[PDB]
From Swiss-Prot, chain A:
GO terms for cellular component: nucleoplasm; post-mRNA release spliceosomal complex; U2-type spliceosomal complex. The gene is CCDC12. Residues 61-88 form a coiled coil. This is Coiled-coil domain-containing protein 12. There is a cross-link at K38 (Glycyl lysine isopeptide (Lys-Gly) (interchain with G-Cter in SUMO2)). The chain holds residues 57 to 148 of 166 of the full protein. Signal peptide: none annotated. It comes from the Eukaryota. The lineage of its organism: Eukaryota, Metazoa, Chordata, Craniata, Vertebrata. Keywords: Acetylation, Coiled coil, Isopeptide bond, Phosphoprotein, Ubl conjugation.
From Swiss-Prot, chain B:
It comes from Homo sapiens. Involved in pre-mRNA splicing as component of the spliceosome. Involved in transcription-coupled repair (TCR), transcription and pre-mRNA splicing. Belongs to the crooked-neck family. This is Pre-mRNA-splicing factor SYF1. Associates with RNA polymerase II, the TCR-specific proteins CKN1/CSA and ERCC6/CSB, and XPA. Identified in the spliceosome C complex. Component of the XAB2 complex, a multimeric protein complex composed of XAB2, PRPF19, AQR, ZNF830, ISY1, and PPIE. Identified in a pentameric intron-binding (IB) complex composed of AQR, XAB2, ISY1, ZNF830 and PPIE that is incorporated into the spliceosome as a preassembled complex. The IB complex does not contain PRPF19. The modification N6-acetyllysine is found at K53. It comes from the Eukaryota. It is found in: Nucleus. HAT repeats lie at residues 2-40, 131-163, 165-199, 204-238, 276-310, 312-346.
From Swiss-Prot, chain C:
It is found in: Nucleus; Nucleus speckle. The gene is CRNKL1. It comes from the Eukaryota. Involved in pre-mRNA splicing process. As a component of the minor spliceosome, involved in the splicing of U12-type introns in pre-mRNAs. HAT repeats lie at residues 1-24, 26-61, 63-97. This is Crooked neck-like protein 1. Widely expressed. Highly expressed in testis. Not detected in brain and lung. Disulfide bonds: none annotated. Belongs to the crooked-neck family. It comes from Homo sapiens (Human). Signal peptide: none annotated. The lineage of its organism: Eukaryota, Metazoa, Chordata, Craniata, Vertebrata. Identified in the spliceosome C complex. Present in a spliceosome complex assembled in vitro containing CRNKL1, HPRP8BP and SNRPB2. Component of the minor spliceosome, which splices U12-type introns. Isoform 2 seems to be predominant in the spliceosome complex. Interacts with PPIL2 (via the PPIase cyclophilin-type domain); they may form a trimeric complex with HSP90.
């Protein structure tokens, strides 16, 4: 038998209780950006990736990548079909 | 001790003499020891009769009678008479014909027990161990309708619904418990809810979580809001537009505690600093110099100007230093003038070093 | 006295106060009539979202989810979507309490569709 909500007054019954899922300190992960939160001239060296903007389409390409993965499988199939058909013809 | 008849009599005398309303030491503690003595003697039916008499008592507080009802259940658990334990708690939970308050002292103490957190939580543990899923869930439904539930009990219920793999109901349970409660409490309820959702169903149907994030942000106190802004913008970085993440970061600069806002301005600058950085942070630095206090403004002014130096915008850079010079007392802030001098030596010229000194000496006069 | 008061001061705030008073004491047969008379009286002259949010909560307590959805649709077809956000917010929470995931998303999508259409315009 398994118990999870009450806090039994018998300690012998307390032993039966299921160990409850502890949380994770989300603030600890937040600290990485809080270390990024140091006020600094973030061109700390003349790093052209900061100086020249990226393509904002990389975030768009990231969303298109998932579709491109689906497309890549179909493209690989279609390319293979042409290669199979042509190699068969070129077997002779 | 060692003289059972004397022990039995003095319990009876204690029960007769002690007024619960004047009891120094809570009266149920007598009843527990009274029942325990018979239980130690194996006289379980007499102990039950003691517990029955105990339930008839209208004690000073509901917690006294509630603790008795627990001991009624706990006795049967030790002797594995689990059906009787359920039966007792069914009678304990059993509603008055009125929709009675937990607090109305004119009502009998027995009536008030129906709301009690301890009794319902115990009965819930009984049903989950012994009985069917739907009957167990019906306890939680009553608890929610009666507004008894703590967020921990919701989290227990949520995990229970995940073990029975009806996660849609589990999300409904989180949503109901958010709707009942108020800040700060709601913060941790959101965190557990979002964690569960993002794993299985955040992959599947992303957009509902954005709206759910938006609902979570509503009225949120700044420390918890700060966490939620970063988490939402991360999700925006993981699956949405980067441009929306920047907007959420802009909210973080606005809402949060002012000293932490200065930190949040640096996050807003630094995540920009790759892609947006040269274009966007020039806007953010100007805004920050207007908003923030003199110490943080001077730090912002220098690093904005130094960024323009590395850009080569020497005319704009010296304009920022000129505006900064209004705040930089040439006596104490010598580090500012020297780092400006290091700019005038390396980038500028000897007459531009003098130009800084024309600014320095005239400001020092003022 | 409430009946007399509401006749002297016919304001939406007073009707809600009277209706909630009966509701608290569980005289639901009386409370409903107060809501029914209110939507009759105001409905042909003025339509405040405040009454319908309250009356939805009544039928929610009654568990008449079908009646609740009728109330919200009747309000949504006539009140502009830009004022109906608090209307939508309670409705979307309502569907989050008792509606299926499919039904929840469609009402949310239609709201988002309106929002994105505003972006497009």
């Amino acid at each position: 038998l398994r118990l999870r909500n009450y806090v039994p007054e018998d300690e012998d019954l307390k032993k039966r209780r299921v160990p409850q899922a502890k949380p994770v300190a989300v603030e600890e992960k937040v600290k990485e950006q809080l270390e990024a939160a140091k006020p600094e001239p973030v061109i700390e060296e003349v790093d052209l990736a900061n100086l020249a903007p990226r393509k904002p389409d990389w975030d768009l390409k990231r969303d298109v990548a998932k579709k491109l993965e689906k497309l890549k499988k179909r493209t690989q199939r279609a390319i293979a079909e042409l290669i199979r058909e042509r190699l068969k013809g070129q077997e002779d | 001790q060692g003289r059972p008849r004397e022990i039995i009599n003095t319990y009876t005398e204690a029960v007769q003499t002690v007024d619960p309303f004047k009891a120094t030491g809570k009266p149920h503690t007598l009843w527990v020891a009274f029942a325990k003595f018979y239980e130690d003697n194996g006289q379980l039916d007499d102990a039950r009769v003691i517990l029955e008499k105990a339930t008839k008592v209208n004690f000073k507080q509901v917690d006294d009678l509630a603790s008795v009802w627990c001991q009624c259940g706990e006795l049967e658990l030790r002797h594995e008479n689990y059906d009787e334990a359920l039966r007792l708690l069914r009678k304990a939970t059993a509603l008055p014909a009125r929709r009675a308050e937990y607090f109305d002292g004119s009502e009998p103490v027995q009536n008030r027990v129906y709301k009690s957190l301890k009794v319902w939580s115990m009965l819930a543990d009984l049903e989950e161990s012994l009985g069917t899923f739907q009957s167990t869930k019906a306890v939680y439904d009553r608890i929610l309708d009666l507004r008894i539930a703590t967020p921990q009990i919701v989290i227990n219920y949520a995990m229970f619904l995940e073990e029975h793999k009806y996660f849609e109901e589990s999300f409904k349970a989180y949503e109901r418990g958010i709707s009942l409660f108020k800040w700060p409490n709601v913060s941790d309820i959101w965190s557990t809810y979002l964690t569960k959702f993002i794993a299985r169903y955040g992959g599947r149907k992303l957009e509902r979580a954005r709206d759910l994030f938006e609902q979570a942000l509503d009225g949120c106190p700044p420390k918890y809001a700060k966490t939620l802004y970063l988490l939402y913008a991360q999700l925006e970085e993981e699956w949405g537009l980067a441009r929306h993440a920047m907007a959420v970061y802009e909210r973080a600069t606005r809402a949060v505690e002012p000293a932490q806002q200065y930190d949040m301005f640096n996050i807003y600058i630094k995540r920009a600093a790759e892609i947006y950085g040269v274009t966007h942070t020039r806007g953010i630095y100007q805004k920050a110099i207007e908003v923030l206090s003199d110490e943080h403004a001077r730090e912002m002014c220098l690093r904005f100007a130094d960024m323009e130096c590395k850009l080569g915008e020497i005319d704009r850079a010296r304009a920022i230093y000129s505006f900064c010079s209004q705040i930089c007392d040439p006596r104490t802030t010598g580090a500012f003038w020297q780092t400006w001098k290091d700019f005038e030596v390396r980038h500028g010229n000897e007459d531009t070093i003098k130009e800084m000194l024309r600014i320095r000496r005239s400001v020092q006069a003022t | 006295i409430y009946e007399r008061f509401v006749l002297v001061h016919p304001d939406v705030k007073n009707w809600i106060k009277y209706a909630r008073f009966e509701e608290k004491h569980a005289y639901f047969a009386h409370a409903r009539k107060v809501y029914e008379r209110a939507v009759e009286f105001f409905g042909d002259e003025h339509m405040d979202e405040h009454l319908y949010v309250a009356f939805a909560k009544f039928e929610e307590n009654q568990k008449e989810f079908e009646r609740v959805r009728v109330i919200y649709k009747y309000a949504l077809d006539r009140i502009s979507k830009q004022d109906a956000q608090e209307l939508f917010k309670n409705y979307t929470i309502f569907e989050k309490k008792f509606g299926d995931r499919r039904g929840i998303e469609d009402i949310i999508v239609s709201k988002r569709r309106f929002q994105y259409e505003e972006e497009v315009k």
